[PDB]
Design an enzyme around this catalytic site. Structure first.
Site: not given
Ligand code: CL
Ligand code: CL
Ligand code: CL
Length: 129
Positions: A46, A50, A59
């Site tokens: 991401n 993350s 996540n």
């Protein structure tokens, strides 16, 4: 492991995900389809640094530890690698915590954008369950 559609539906049901928090099995299968294409080894990085892991792209900012997400939590108390296993137990148990966190399956933006409000039963149609 890349699951078959009905194979994954059966595994999810085995682990108590069917109708968990009111979300029918088709919702979960649909979410997994668009998050990972049913591949337990799926990972995606991401913008915030993350990473999302496994069949439900859980996540590392909140839910698991990968050692490389500064300021993050590990609310499922697992290494993120556990979410990549051919055995979906860790992903399912963590998903149960996530979906109970307040916003239901909206926690999965892909569920909101691609599954929510659709004929999700199609995802388990024909499956011996
Ligand atoms: Cl369904
Ligand atoms: Cl970390
Ligand atoms: Cl999306």
């Amino acid at each position: 492991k890349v699951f078959g559609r009905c194979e994954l539906a059966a595994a999810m049901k085995r682990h108590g995900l069917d109708n968990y928090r009111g979300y029918s099995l088709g919702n979960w299968v649909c979410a997994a389809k668009f998050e990972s294409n049913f591949n337990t080894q799926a990972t995606n990085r991401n913008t915030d640094g993350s990473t999302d892991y496994g069949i439900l792209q859980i996540n590392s900012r909140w839910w698991c530890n990968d050692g490389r997400t500064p300021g993050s939590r590990n609310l499922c108390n697992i290494p993120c690698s556990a979410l990549l296993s051919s055995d979906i137990t860790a992903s399912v148990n963590c998903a149960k915590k996530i979906v109970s966190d307040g916003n239901g399956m909206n926690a999965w933006v892909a569920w909101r954008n691609r599954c929510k409000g659709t004929d999700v039963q199609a995802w388990i149609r024909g499956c011996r369950l």
